[model samples]
Target: ACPAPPPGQPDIRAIGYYTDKAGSVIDPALQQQNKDATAPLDRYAADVARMSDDYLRNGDPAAAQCTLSWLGAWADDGAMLGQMIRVNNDQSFYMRQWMLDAVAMAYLKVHDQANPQQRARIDPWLQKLARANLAYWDNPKRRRNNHYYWGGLGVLATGLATDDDALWQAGHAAFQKGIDDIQDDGSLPLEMARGQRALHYHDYALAPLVMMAELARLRGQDWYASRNHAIDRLARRVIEGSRDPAWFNQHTGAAQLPLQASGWVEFYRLRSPDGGVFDAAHARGPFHSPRLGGDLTLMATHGIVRTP
Candidate 1:
């Protein structure tokens, strides 16, 4: 049985196994593979992203505000190597996007309703960084199916938020191209190559589409519904065919089922009925980095708090 709840720690009702050892909240089997991957990092990141959600659900946005400060501390760590050079590593993209998105979300929530002068001080820098990131996708050289798909969506969201028409147009074009090239029969071809692991990719692909849809809706546009339908079909394919290992065509290793469901939960939260591709076991398992999942959960839960 679990110990009684602490005096002030929030009782968030974590559903999985909870070990008594220090830093042993997750299962040993899950922790053994990536021993170097720290759990505290994930916990901190997840807490920051979910802080607002927890606050809102429990009734205290100001208390939730401290979560962001905790995240900011580890936002730049020197793991795998020194801090600056670490950005060159492929994994850096995960951190970069998380920080960028988190900051952007914070600004949207706080300064969105501020007076013009206050807004002017903060909005330009945020818009510029967001737009510049989006513009990166405009490069023909950078237009690969996987990378460009996400890049385009990031650009589109930032562009729409700041009313940057040129950036928005660039993102829109890239997104359409990605949809045309990568999406087939509702599955993302790049992700499908991972055989059993392709399910994880499906989850990744669906998230951006959800974000894109949200952005479009914010702009009084209806494009998100169509995109949502496309993702929903792909998710359904995963649900119906999850048992057939043969159906998957890429990354056919020992198949990490837990990670796949963790990804799907985000999609479910975003759009229901079409949600619930995975069971409760998968949803509760440890999978992706806590930081990335945390940021995503926060965004999904809070919606974009847009400012002028």
Candidate 2:
């Protein structure tokens, strides 16, 4: 299979410092600050991840090798991310988590094809980023929200790629904490408090959780079934909410913006295709999120052996 050319050089320096104006409150000016602070790095990850995922989906080992070449260069240059000198606000943590999510997933898809030299350079770099994620989110007192879930996925993906049992266990522990936060009714207290964006945040939250659960499954664990199958309850709620968020609107007493389905639904549907949620997720076909490990639509259909 042929490959598409990925753009730009990896900037190890651009990722070391960031300023975030929008911590949580979403407004135009804050949105611009959030975007301006991380757009380049986000775009860089998306392009690299999408290209690597494409090569994997095509079963193009040579192209995958070429993709790894760039990755190795980034690693050699000490540009694997999360070595922040000055991270302003909580938004920088979010960026770092998401960057790890995208990049780690891409590595999972391509690691087997990596040469000894590539793995030698890339593995240590990824472990460093994952350690950064672990340091930030491994606290029990830290809010067990979407940020923690995303950070867990990043660390978990890194663990699987590098075969680090400690990181693997730490990552899955966060998953357990997330499931524990899910009420029997499937509502997350923190996300529900987001007022107008409660449903949106739930949808956002499920993406990383689902991805982490899938990783857990590879390790012979049933994370989705944990906490009395709380993840399923949450998934069904989000599925129903996506179709008609009136319940959320009424409950939160705040009119919500239109809820867009993310790439997580694709992964869930791939694992269990027997639900109306698949139909609910239909309009958002071919879903792809770099942070959820690239083109999930293709990954779901074609499949990748993520386990070692």
Candidate 3:
């Protein structure tokens, strides 16, 4: 028999920073700011867990249903834009991408619980979202080369989750098209145009593909290996170029670098060869929300490891 797959590791070093009251590990000055910013999402974490647990224990799947009301109230026409009029008015590709991710994460959690009724409620919206995103790619007015990449991921994630064949086929084709545009050196030209800030885009680009690949695995489909390889290569490039510092070009003029623990966790979690854990000392604000970590930990605990 083949050897069992390695267990996924947590970033143990970062965990300490999360609980530490002292300013030593996490930046103490920013603690209050971080708490305020994350408060909204933090409020719902326990409720989501409790509802999921109740469903699991009682075997009444309907009890597991939870709404991302914050998203629904703020999202513009199904997109996850902010509540502000300016954010709602701006129908930018990035804003739409954010919506896709928010909805996708919510649905993926519902799917993990194996709550068919809850999933059924979420599927149609996801299908509509996938189709909308696909149409965005078809528009010639969309200037950025990475737009297709983002749309490809959005469609693939939502499509896979909902089993929408048309969206899935379109998503795969778009992903392939985006791959063809990659240069020999593996850098995306659109990202390079941002000059020093290119690293920021490179880092931001990985999450959508990770979601896509995970969704495919959940559906028992072929993994999006090419996208995964591209992300791994880009992540290594950032680590090499920056010497593994938190700073990136996009973060210029800031008093300090953006402490993106969640990005680090996602990157290492998905790409680590040994499923190695991250150091808690490295965990910092922006990714410091216990709710986010709890969701990820629950997913990991349930044997939902993404397959190769």
Q: TM-scores across all candidates?
A: 0.59, 0.87, 0.58
Query: Lowest summed lDDT over 10 consecutive residues: which window, candidate 1?
Result: 5-14
Counting clashing residue pairs in each candidate, in order, gives: 6, 0, 7
Residue 65 displacement in candidate 2 (angstroms): 1.3
Question: lDDT of each structure?
Answer: 0.46, 0.74, 0.46
Q: For model 1, what is the C-alpha lDDT against the true structure?
A: 0.46
TM-score of 3: 0.58
Give the per-residue Cα lDDT of candidate 2 at 107: 80
Candidate 2 lDDT over residue span 155-225, tens digit each = 99999988888888888887887888888778888888776778988898888899898788666787777
Pairs of colliding residues, candidate 1: 112-307, 193-250, 194-250, 194-251, 195-249, 195-250
Best by lDDT: 2
Give each prediction's root-mean-square deviation over alpha carbons: 9.8, 3.7, 11.6
RMSD in Å for model 2: 3.7
Which lDDT tens digits does candidate 1 get at residues 1-308?
Answer: 11221122111111222243221234566445323343333344355445534443454545334543332233222111123123212333433344344444443333333356544544465455455455444566642545555655646655654567876786677556545543556667666554434666665665555555556666777654455455556655555545444445433343434333334355354555534345642455433333222344444555444222
Better candidate by TM-score, 1 or 3: 1
Over 4 Å off, model 1: 1-48, 54-90, 109-118, 194-196, 241-244, 249-259, 263-308
Q: What is the lDDT of candidate 2?
A: 0.74
Put down candidate 3 lDDT per residue, 103-195, tens digits, no spaces: 454444445544455455467766765665666556686654555666776676667656778878876776666555455555566655543
